[PDB]
Each structure stands twice: as structure tokens, then as C-alpha cells.
Design a protein around this ligand. Structure first.
Ligand SMILES: [Zn+2]
Ligand SMILES: [Zn+2]
Ligand SMILES: [Zn+2]
Length: 70
């Protein structure tokens, strides 16, 4: 339902200021790739590690869910 992916401090992830509900939200690289963020304000970057928010309506807009946690 919600992507269970975890990453470490030197793993890249995605911020998306268009989809997030707060600036600490992030999704893993595969969830970004399998979603639709064209013309979004997104950035691939480091985040000090984290857990993917894809599929979680409390953290991420539904239109920003990838195809596998939609
Ligand atoms: Zn987005
Ligand atoms: Zn994910
Ligand atoms: Zn996903």
C-alpha cells in the first residue's frame, strides 16, 4: 500500500515540492521513475536517509503516487 523502501545517507532519493505535504517528504528513485512528475518542482538529492512516502496520503499527493503504490 505504502512503499516500504528505506535508504541511507549516501543513497539518492527524490524531493518533489509539487507533491509533498511537508519539506521532509521524499520518495525513492524507483517510485519517482514509475510516477508522473513532469513540470513538477522535483530534485534528485541526498536526504540524510529516509523511508519512502509513496502511497501515503498523509505525506504525498495521490497524483504523485507511482503506478505500483496507486
Ligand atoms: Zn511530483
Ligand atoms: Zn518507494
Ligand atoms: Zn511507489
Amino acid at each position: 500500500a505504502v512503499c516500504g523502501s528505506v535508504w541511507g545517507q549516501n543513497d539518492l532519493a527524490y524531493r518533489c515540492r509539487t507533491c509533498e505535504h511537508d519539506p521532509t517528504c521524499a520518495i525513492c528513485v524507483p517510485c519517482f521513475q514509475n510516477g508522473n512528475h513532469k513540470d513538477h518542482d522535483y530534485s534528485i538529492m541526498y536526504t540524510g536517509g529516509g523511508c519512502c512516502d509513496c502511497g501515503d496520503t498523509t505525506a504525498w499527493k495521490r497524483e504523485g503516487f507511482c503506478s505500483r503504490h496507486k
